[PDB]
């Protein structure tokens, strides 16, 4: 006679059909249980006796150790919803907490039942189809096929809001002034009455979503606030976490590291300060999730500080839709770097880091990019718009910087915030070739199979030298050869290479790197008052670059 | 054909399914731009809500067609494109007007209009939709499906392409002079007349399309004027090579003669006709950078001729037209974009040059979407077909920022190459 709401279309992929998976028997105990339960349902609708015609089966296996004075009923559809088309996605963004409107009301109804409530097409229930355990060999067995969105098949997610928000339609109509988002489950009444008209309002609905045929626990009150929800912690002016459970373990398996990092690059969010670049090398080198991964010297030093900074919990706030965005940053140590968005001084309404895994040679500046740009693209989602930048860098240091510099770049306009550390520049390589500068030659070779190899130079001053190198490389060298220069050079000189590759990582001028020798050299060319840098075709034999070949080991003197 | 008030059934690929293309957050501006937009679209019938037994979803942003007061919603069917093809069985079968490269004026009009007349098969709409988002996830996301041939779908123009000549036609007729060919959304009306009057062609054109209902918006500022100026009047001839130059002087270091020799070097990739040695004795010893050496008299020949062997082109006038036509973009000096379009590394079908500068054009991004959009409409009008980017920008910001000086109506591909710094020497 009656379902409601209307029924979502649905089918299955083309040329596909659906599970069979027959019958796995256990005795005759907990099919009474079940027995209850499936005609407790059997009522009109939930579900239906299945003629002898029934095809498919995906079975139903009674597991009430889930459940106490109840014995639950959980089927398992994983042949069905392999067959099942799919659908528009059910969102998993968790609506950042960050990016929440300040509320004097909120309210929360269950409704996971409701999906047992909604009609299925017609025509996709006759694969939803599941078989009770009778008593005999003979032919007749309990057939019972569903008349609902059946709690764990494919798209009941799916059909279930889109009928949910196809029910809200009118209550959301008549009530233009009421809030009303969904998680899954979680029915998010929100709005701006004393408790006592908001539950005026929330009854009418849960009589709306009553007269729509749903669920409510109760004609009880409702709300529990704070909540619980997605790891937050939801009290009005305030939104954090707290489940922190951090190891003081003896060992500590890559397992119980990535839960380490995954927790911290939670609290990460909203907590001033966490740091965890160190912790993360640790994956390096291993597969098995229960294994030896030695920590190390400084690892035990981040654990150490934000050990600290969660001893006093942390407070967000919510979002003034009227109110301008806000974001500084400063560089927490080296390489990382730490962030946080305002709307008023100290009111917070989240935090966050940022390293540079990307690369293997940058400097302050690019990473003060890549970190203004990870927020951005933060911001848009959170809240729809890009904040204002405040951050430790004047103008000079970085449009001296994003011109020479030969990647496009565009910083929505910032604002020099005199807070130390600086980000600045520690070296600029003259761009013009030095006079009187003496000028050295260099060069590095290794024979691409073996450990030791050698680096050395030829000046116009008349000097030459050769140095020999234990356990290098080819490339590796060439950068000793730079190095070797630079090392017995006076404060101001020019250098000539022919590796393309030595060019490129110092005139990149670099200034943090975990290449031991790179960050030599990044350091002399801070002693260094000028430094010219320049290259030449490799044997090609240029005057001076002809010297250093020969001079270096020519497959063998032989 | 032309199939009047009827369907005309569209299709897919050998083993291809319906785009999943995830949607990229919007600000809240573009958002309700195209809540706007998209509500109207539905009033007027052209597109319609979404229930989940559709899990199709191609992109889409919004822009400005123009900087007007007017936003503009601008569909991404890319990849919904790619797995459609059925149509080159075409009435016709003329490759592209090797001309239209040629002509004094370019006059580029966009019929996108046309297009929200024809109704699409409603068998097809599913794979159209597409997903207005929302801010921070609050809520599921709008979803519409087209319900008309689509602009920028890559099958629109094909389904309604009968009707198009059946409307050129009598224009193509009596003005026959006149080049028309037509590249996804627009035409790309071409001629040699003076300025004053190639205008009033395009604009008899204009009120011609109008006059049968296809309408254009494409107006330039005014009714009927006189005084000259750049606009969207692509003037194929004028637009010329930004050759490889080497410097002149009468003060030449080491370095200086250094320099020279690494990029005359490097230039022997390109054309192996070219010498050096001579060029390279100079050098002979270990001097100074700075030293000052008189530029010989049997060497001054060499980069003197080789300044000659570089302007003449090499091997490589040869575009296949089922190979990718790729560009790339070194961002020099200041102000100044380089760029070059090859099929294959070292043998550039064509080598140009952007620049600006800094008014309201004040930073990379917009100068680099620019330089873009700039290659691309070129590519069009010499290949009728748009190349494949390689930018010098960390695809973060690209993605952040692409859309907010972006006025064309279609969507290179781009991938974001990481580095050059020695390319960089004018290319
Ligand atoms: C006390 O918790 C809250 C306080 C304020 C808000 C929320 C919850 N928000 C919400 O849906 O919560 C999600 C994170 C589950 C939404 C809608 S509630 C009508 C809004 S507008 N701000
Ligand atoms: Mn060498």
Same mark, same amino acid.
């Given at each position: 006679?009656?379902?409601?709401?209307?029924?979502?279309?649905?089918?299955?992929?083309?040329?596909?059909?659906?599970?069979?998976?027959?019958?796995?028997?256990?005795?005759?105990?907990?099919?009474?249980?079940?027995?209850?339960?499936? =005609?407790?349902?059997?009522?009109?609708?939930?579900?239906?006796?299945?003629?002898?015609?029934?095809?498919?089966?995906?079975?139903?296996?009674?597991?009430?150790?889930?459940?106490?004075?109840?014995?639950?009923?959980?089927?398992? *559809?994983?042949?069905?919803?392999?067959?099942?088309?799919?659908?528009?996605?059910?969102?998993?963004?968790?609506?950042?907490?960050?990016?929440?409107?300040?509320?004097?009301?909120?309210?929360?109804?269950?409704?996971?039942?409701?999906?047992?409530?909604?009609? %299925?097409?017609?025509? *996709?229930?006759?694969?939803?189809? *599941?078989?009770?355990?009778?008593?005999?060999?003979?032919?007749?067995?309990?057939?019972?096929?569903?008349?609902?969105?059946?709690?764990?098949?494919?798209?009941?997610?799916?059909?279930?809001?889109?009928?949910?928000?196809?029910?809200?339609?009118?209550?959301?109509?008549?009530?233009?002034?009421?809030?009303?988002?969904?998680?899954?489950?979680?029915?998010?009444?929100?709005?701006?009455?004393?408790?006592?008209?908001?539950?005026?309002?929330?009854?009418?609905?849960?009589?709306?979503?009553?007269?729509?045929?749903?669920? =409510?626990?109760?004609?009880?009150?409702?709300?529990?606030?704070?909540?619980?929800?997605?790891?937050?912690?939801?009290?009005?002016?305030?939104?954090?976490?707290?489940?922190?459970?951090?190891?003081?373990?003896?060992?500590?398996?890559?397992?119980?590291?990535?839960?380490?990092?995954?927790?911290?690059?939670?609290?990460?969010?909203?907590?001033?300060?966490?740091?965890?670049?160190?912790?993360?090398? %640790?994956?390096?080198?291993?597969?098995?999730?229960?294994?030896?991964?030695?920590?190390?010297?400084?690892?035990?030093?981040?654990?150490?500080?934000?050990?600290?900074?969660?001893?006093?919990?942390?407070?967000?706030?919510?979002?003034?839709?009227?109110?301008?965005?806000?974001?500084?940053?400063?560089?927490?140590?080296?390489?990382?770097? =730490?962030?946080?968005?305002?709307?008023?001084?100290?009111?917070?309404?989240?935090?966050?880091?940022?390293?540079?895994?990307?690369?293997?040679?940058?400097?302050?500046?690019?990473?003060?990019?890549?970190?203004?740009?990870?927020?951005?693209?933060?911001?848009?989602?959170?809240?729809?718009?890009?904040?204002?930048?405040?951050?430790?860098?004047?103008?000079?240091?970085?449009?001296?910087?994003?011109?020479?510099?030969?990647?496009?770049?565009?910083?929505?306009?910032?604002?020099?915030?005199?807070?130390?550390?600086?980000?600045?520049?520690?070296?600029?390589?003259?761009?013009?070739?030095?006079?009187?500068?003496?000028? *050295?030659?260099?060069?590095?070779?290794?024979?691409?199979?073996?450990?030791?190899?050698?680096?050395?130079?030829?000046?116009?001053?008349?000097?030459?030298?050769?140095?020999?190198?234990?356990?290098?490389?080819?490339?590796?060298?060439?950068?000793?050869?730079?190095?070797?220069?630079?090392?017995?050079?006076?404060?101001?000189?020019?250098?000539?290479?022919?590796?393309?590759?030595?060019?490129?990582?110092?005139?990149?001028?670099?200034?943090?790197?975990?290449?031991?020798?790179?960050?030599?050299?990044?350091?002399?060319?801070?002693?260094?008052?000028?430094?010219? %840098?320049?290259?030449?075709?490799?044997?090609?034999?240029?005057?001076?670059?002809?010297?250093?070949?020969?001079?270096?080991?020519?497959?063998?003197?032989? | 054909?032309?199939?009047?008030?009827?369907?005309?059934?569209?299709?897919?690929? &050998?083993?291809?399914?319906?785009?999943?293309?995830?949607?990229?957050?919007?600000? /809240? /501006?573009?958002?309700?731009?195209?809540?706007?937009?998209?509500?109207?679209?539905?009033?007027?019938?052209?597109?319609?809500?979404?229930?989940?037994?559709? &899990?199709?979803?191609?992109?889409?942003?919004?822009?400005?067609?123009?900087?007007?007061?007017?936003?503009?919603?601008?569909?991404?069917?890319?990849?919904?494109?790619?797995?459609?093809?059925?149509?080159?069985?075409?009435?016709?079968?003329?490759?592209?007007?090797?001309?239209?490269?040629?002509?004094?004026?370019?006059?580029?009009?966009?019929?996108?209009?046309?297009?929200?007349?024809?109704?699409?098969?409603?068998?097809?709409?599913?794979?159209?939709?597409?997903?207005?988002?929302?801010?921070?996830?609050?809520?599921?996301?709008? $979803?519409?499906?087209?319900?008309?041939?689509?602009?920028?779908?890559?099958?629109? &123009?094909?389904?309604?392409?009968?009707?198009?000549?059946?409307?050129?036609?009598?224009?193509?007729?009596?003005?026959?002079?006149?080049?028309?060919?037509?590249?996804?959304?627009?035409?790309?009306?071409?001629?040699?007349?003076?300025?004053?009057?190639?205008?009033?062609?395009?604009?008899?054109?204009?009120?011609?399309?109008?006059?049968?209902?296809?309408?254009?918006?494409?107006?330039?500022?005014?009714?009927?004027?006189?005084?000259?100026?750049?606009?969207?009047?692509?003037?194929?001839?004028?637009?010329?090579?930004?050759?490889?130059?080497?410097?002149?002087?009468?003060?030449?270091?080491?370095?200086?003669?250094?320099?020279?020799?690494?990029?005359?070097?490097?230039?022997?990739?390109?054309?192996?006709?070219?010498?050096?040695?001579?060029?390279?004795?100079?050098?002979?010893?270990?001097?100074?950078?700075?030293?000052?050496?008189?530029?010989?008299?049997?060497?001054?020949?060499?980069?003197?001729?080789?300044?000659?062997?570089?302007?003449?082109?090499?091997?490589?006038?040869?575009?296949? &037209?089922?190979?990718?036509?790729?560009?790339?973009?070194?961002?020099?000096?200041?102000?100044?974009?380089?760029?070059?379009?090859?099929? /294959?590394?070292?043998?550039?079908?064509?080598?140009?040059?952007?620049?600006?500068? $800094?008014?309201?054009?004040?930073?990379?991004?917009?100068?680099?979407?620019?330089?873009?959009?700039?290659?691309?409409?070129?590519?069009?009008?010499?290949?009728?077909?748009?190349?494949?980017?390689?930018?010098?920008?960390?695809?973060?910001?690209?993605?952040?920022?692409?859309?907010?000086?972006?006025?064309?109506?279609?969507?290179?591909?781009?991938?974001?190459?990481?580095?050059?710094?020695?390319?960089?020497?004018?290319?």
């Amino acid at each position: 006679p009656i379902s409601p709401i209307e029924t979502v279309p649905v089918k299955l992929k083309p040329g596909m059909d659906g599970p069979k998976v027959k019958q796995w028997p256990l005795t005759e105990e907990k099919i009474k249980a079940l027995v209850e339960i499936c =005609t407790e349902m059997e009522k009109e609708g939930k579900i239906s006796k299945i003629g002898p015609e029934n095809p498919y089966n995906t079975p139903v296996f009674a597991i009430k150790k889930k459940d106490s004075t109840k014995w639950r009923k959980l089927v398992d *559809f994983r042949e069905l919803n392999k067959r099942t088309q799919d659908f528009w996605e059910v969102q998993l963004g968790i609506p950042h907490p960050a990016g929440l409107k300040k509320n004097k009301s909120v309210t929360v109804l269950d409704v996971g039942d409701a999906y047992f409530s909604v009609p %299925l097409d017609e025509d *996709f229930r006759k694969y939803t189809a *599941f078989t009770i355990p009778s008593i005999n060999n003979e032919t007749p067995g309990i057939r019972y096929q569903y008349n609902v969105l059946p709690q764990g098949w494919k798209g009941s997610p799916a059909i279930f809001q889109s009928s949910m928000t196809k029910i809200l339609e009118p209550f959301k109509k008549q009530n233009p002034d009421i809030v009303i988002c969904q998680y899954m489950d979680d029915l998010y009444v929100g709005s701006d009455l004393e408790i006592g008209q908001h539950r005026t309002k929330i009854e009418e609905l849960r009589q709306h979503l009553l007269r729509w045929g749903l669920t =409510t626990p109760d004609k009880k009150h409702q709300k529990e606030p704070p909540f619980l929800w997605m790891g937050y912690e939801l009290h009005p002016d305030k939104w954090t976490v707290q489940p922190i459970v951090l190891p003081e373990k003896d060992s500590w398996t890559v397992n119980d590291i990535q839960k380490l990092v995954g927790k911290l690059n939670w609290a990460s969010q909203i907590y001033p300060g966490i740091k965890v670049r160190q912790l993360s090398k %640790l994956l390096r080198g291993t597969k098995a999730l229960t294994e030896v991964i030695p920590l190390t010297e400084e690892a035990e030093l981040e654990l150490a500080e934000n050990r600290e900074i969660l001893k006093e919990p942390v407070h967000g706030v919510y979002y003034d839709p009227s109110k301008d965005l806000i974001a500084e940053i400063q560089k927490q140590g080296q390489g990382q770097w =730490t962030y946080q968005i305002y709307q008023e001084p100290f009111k917070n309404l989240k935090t966050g880091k940022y390293a540079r895994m990307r690369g293997a040679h940058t400097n302050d500046v690019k990473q003060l990019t890549e970190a203004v740009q990870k927020i951005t693209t933060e911001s848009i989602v959170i809240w729809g718009k890009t904040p204002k930048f405040k951050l430790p860098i004047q103008k000079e240091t970085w449009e001296t910087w994003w011109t020479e510099y030969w990647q496009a770049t565009w910083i929505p306009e910032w604002e020099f915030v005199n807070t130390p550390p600086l980000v600045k520049l520690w070296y600029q390589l003259e761009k013009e070739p030095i006079v009187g500068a003496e000028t *050295f030659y260099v060069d590095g070779a290794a024979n691409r199979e073996t450990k030791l190899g050698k680096a050395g130079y030829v000046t116009n001053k008349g000097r030459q030298k050769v140095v020999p190198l234990t356990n290098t490389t080819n490339q590796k060298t060439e950068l000793q050869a730079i190095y070797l220069a630079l090392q017995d050079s006076g404060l101001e000189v020019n250098i000539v290479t022919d590796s393309q590759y030595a060019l490129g990582i110092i005139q990149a001028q670099p200034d943090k790197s975990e290449s031991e020798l790179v960050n030599q050299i990044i350091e002399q060319l801070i002693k260094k008052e000028k430094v010219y %840098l320049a290259w030449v075709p490799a044997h090609k034999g240029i005057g001076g670059n002809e010297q250093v070949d020969k001079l270096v080991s020519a497959g063998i003197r032989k | 054909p032309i199939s009047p008030i009827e369907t005309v059934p569209v299709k897919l690929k &050998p083993g291809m399914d319906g785009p999943k293309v995830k949607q990229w957050p919007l600000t /809240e /501006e573009k958002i309700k731009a195209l809540v706007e937009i998209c509500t109207e679209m539905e009033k007027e019938g052209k597109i319609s809500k979404i229930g989940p037994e559709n &899990p199709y979803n191609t992109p889409v942003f919004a822009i400005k067609k123009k900087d007007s007061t007017k936003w503009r919603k601008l569909v991404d069917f890319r990849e919904l494109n790619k797995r459609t093809q059925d149509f080159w069985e075409v009435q016709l079968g003329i490759p592209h007007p090797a001309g239209l490269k040629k002509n004094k004026s370019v006059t580029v009009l966009d019929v996108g209009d046309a297009y929200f007349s024809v109704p699409l098969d409603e068998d097809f709409r599913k794979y159209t939709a597409f997903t207005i988002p929302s801010i921070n996830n609050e809520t599921p996301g709008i $979803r519409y499906q087209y319900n008309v041939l689509p602009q920028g779908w890559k099958g629109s &123009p094909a389904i309604f392409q009968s009707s198009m000549t059946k409307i050129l036609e009598p224009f193509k007729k009596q003005n026959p002079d006149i080049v028309i060919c037509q590249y996804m959304d627009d035409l790309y009306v071409g001629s040699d007349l003076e300025i004053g009057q190639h205008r009033t062609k395009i604009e008899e054109l204009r009120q011609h399309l109008l006059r049968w209902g296809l309408t254009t918006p494409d107006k330039k500022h005014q009714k009927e004027p006189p005084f000259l100026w750049m606009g969207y009047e692509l003037h194929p001839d004028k637009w010329t090579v930004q050759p490889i130059v080497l410097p002149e002087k009468d003060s030449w270091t080491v370095n200086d003669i250094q320099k020279l020799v690494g990029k005359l070097n490097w230039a022997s990739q390109i054309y192996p006709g070219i010498k050096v040695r001579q060029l390279s004795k100079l050098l002979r010893g270990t001097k100074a950078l700075t030293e000052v050496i008189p530029l010989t008299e049997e060497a001054e020949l060499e980069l003197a001729e080789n300044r000659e062997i570089l302007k003449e082109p090499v091997h490589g006038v040869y575009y296949d &037209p089922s190979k990718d036509l790729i560009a790339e973009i070194q961002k020099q000096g200041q102000g100044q974009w380089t760029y070059q379009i090859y099929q /294959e590394p070292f043998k550039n079908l064509k080598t140009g040059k952007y620049a600006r500068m $800094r008014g309201a054009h004040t930073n990379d991004v917009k100068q680099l979407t620019e330089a873009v959009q700039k290659i691309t409409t070129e590519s069009i009008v010499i290949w009728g077909k748009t190349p494949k980017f390689k930018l010098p920008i960390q695809k973060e910001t690209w993605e952040t920022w692409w859309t907010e000086y972006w006025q064309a109506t279609w969507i290179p591909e781009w991938e974001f190459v990481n580095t050059p710094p020695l390319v960089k020497l004018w290319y």
